[PDB]
């Protein structure tokens, strides 16, 4: 859960 977290939001700021 934790690592699926953090790549979720990475990726929407990425954006």
Do not use: D
């Amino acid at each position: 859960a934790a690592a699926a977290a953090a790549l979720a939001a990475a990726l929407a700021q990425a954006l």
